[model samples]
Target: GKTFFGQPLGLSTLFMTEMWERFSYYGMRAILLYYMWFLISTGDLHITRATAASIMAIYASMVYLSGTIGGFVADRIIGARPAVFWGGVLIMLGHIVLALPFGASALFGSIILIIIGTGFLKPNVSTLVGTLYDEHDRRRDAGFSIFVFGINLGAFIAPLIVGAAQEAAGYHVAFSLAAIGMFIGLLVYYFGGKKTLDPHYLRPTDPLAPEEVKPLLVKVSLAVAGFIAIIVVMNLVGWNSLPAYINLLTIVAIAIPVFYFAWMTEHLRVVSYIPLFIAAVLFWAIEEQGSVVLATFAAERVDSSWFPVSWFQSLNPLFIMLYTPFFAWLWTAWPSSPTKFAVGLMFAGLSFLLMAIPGALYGTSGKVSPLWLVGSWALVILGEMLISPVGLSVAFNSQMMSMWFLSSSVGSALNAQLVTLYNAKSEVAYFSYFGLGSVVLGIVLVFL
Candidate 1:
């Protein structure tokens, strides 16, 4: 009866689910940077640009970092289906608080809710999407492409409304718009999912036994209590500042790959995968600047006189949607993941190096053309084509994807510290050096 691009009807449900979820997420991000920094010009919050960017970076890191554990819970404890549902609830509640005017207090509180919520949502949405099709289905890749299109579509449109709402109403009302976006998605997911999806979607593929749950909880409670004691130890040792706290998390994020690879040491030639793995960490740090560093660039240095500054956030997703179909037809199906990723590194590095030009010549004090930001995104998308592939559909290999989840987490953890170094004075040097590091790694990957 119902079909989505000749695929299962469940796809349409997942599509709409991801779309509205992204709408709320990106829509809030559309104005959030401004909500914190540059408040002197715009409105209220008393944070510096660097502090705001750092916190946002750490916040994003946790959202991604929690995924590794979230997937475990989805597979082992609760079903993925319930995880997405409850995750959506938490995210909606977070935005509801953000709709109030408690300033930084509200911002951080929403941050905690959202980070854990996204963890629950992000890991398993793809697994649900994957379950819709069996292996050897021709529609699989294309459907994933369409699903990603929905992702960017929501991301692309959100800023248009949220940014305008902020200017017309205020930041609090604009956040309420985000809450409304998630609420509609929740309703769609529950009703439409039942209508479209298989009954087994509610059952875990590898659910934990009743006897197993108690031991797992015992270890987890100790782990949680250990972290509380650790933080207190830090404060007692005079490591109580914001940057210090971020650095502590950064240490944990960096150590993850180390510990994980060590544990997996007996698997295979794990050393061979290390270079590409490191390159990906570098790649994401380069790729995921749409909100933190680049958003600040748009607000500060770019001549966004014709459009709202927040609308610039749309370009990353816009490029993803635009480039996706073309690349689909002209698929590289490249030689090897490592070599192909090398080329991705080149383009990503060059993207920032391009930005360094405007920074060096015009300087951050004056506004530059919007095309500069446009060109940067254009290059970055060229890199995305080589690397990210598609809709995060089932990999069927948990260990491989686990590395990627942590890759993104480590990238954002690195971002938390590095973005703090960005401002008017360090703009050119920051772009050039980080850009150069990626290129150097790109070269090394070819040989290594």
Candidate 2:
């Protein structure tokens, strides 16, 4: 296989695959809210702001939640390669459904498809990347940095392209573009990936034993049917109320992680990170609001004559790209302690505290300068640069990433619940409370 950029050829293949996968995912996300909130007369679904936000939160939660299942499926059934391929197909199909103008039914169907697809795709792809290098390889971290750069690079550009399409044509056009992006990704995997990816890495890590297969299949089928039955019951019982469904999902979300952490408590390294996880819960509960409350605010309250509302999304990735190196340098150059993690939590909290500025000064009555969001996101990204990578590194290095993923899933669920309560009057107070909580937690981390 030919090398690209001095790394293994497989690295380049996975990099492009992930880049386009994120491109399609983030591209749709860039306009998904506007598609929901715009009036039917304006060729949109006219969903309420809070409902849209809740749905977005649920969607994000499932994306991670499914990764757990996907990992299981890949390890026990098919290999990572097939999982990635099929997941890419489902993702493309999901976007195609979204490209249609069929209304809420199409949206729901697409969400389900994308959820399942991403579950198959996301974790497996990352796992494949890890397979590219030997355990002791020094270039491994550098390779990951390049990989992450690919992710942010795709995330940064998607909003601009998709947002422009939405503004010029409509939501369907934007979604169609997202579908095309995934299609391109699949093509890359079909051609270049086959040549570059090692055959050994394409097989399942732990195929199920012949004796175990029958019971596993039986149990899996029952679980799937039960899940479907519950959804049907929810539809009949709590059909009109978004909050009811959210409440139910929230309970489930919180429980899964609680059970996960409890199961892993015997592992000392995992146990040691519990405090860090708690801080992340609070930090993410604020940072993730950027796509929901913040996105809504940008559309409804912020002046956007100079740019599309979705373009505001690019700011996070933009800041990430610009600041990653500085944070990387800081960590290597400085002494390590729990204090560093605490500083990250403090920064995240401070970001929301900064968000409280615009509302406090000018009030939420009308649009304000985009600079307000720019400044706010900058702080949050700085904090993310500190804590997020550290958390993931510690978890992965310690072989406890499953626990971390569960923690993040729980945090996203919390964000979903809080976002439903977000409005102009609540906005200032919401930011203030969580921001302060993060700050306090950060301080607590220092002492721990």
Top-scoring candidate (lDDT): 1
Off by over 4 Å in 2: 1-6, 39-47, 225-240, 265-270, 335-340, 390-404
Stretches off by above 4 angstroms in model 1 are 38-46, 265-268, 332-334, 391-403
Look at candidate 1 and give me any clashing residue pairs.
none
- Over the stretch 1-448, how does candidate 2's per-residue lDDT look in tens digits? 5565556778888899989999999999988877787643355565567777888887887777778778788877788889899999999999999898777779878998998998888888777777788788766666767677778888898999999999999888999999999999999987877888878747776888989999988998997898788879988875537667777777788887677778864487887777777777767767777888889888888878877889999998888888877765755665354665678789888988888777888887877888888998998888777655421211131123334556567777887787888887787887788788888888888787
Writing each residue's lDDT as its tens digit, candidate 1 over 1-448 gives 6578778889999999989999999999889888886453455665567878888788878888877776777777677788889989989999999898677768778988988887787777767877788888878877777887898899999999898998889999999999999999899999998888877757677777889989999999997898788899999999888788888888888887888778766445687778878888888887777689999888889877777899988888888888876777666341588987888888889989999998788667888999988999899888877777553222352223344678778888989988989988899999999888888889889688
TM per candidate: 0.94, 0.91
RMSD list, candidates in order: 2.5, 3.1
lDDT scores for all predictions? Answer: 0.82, 0.79
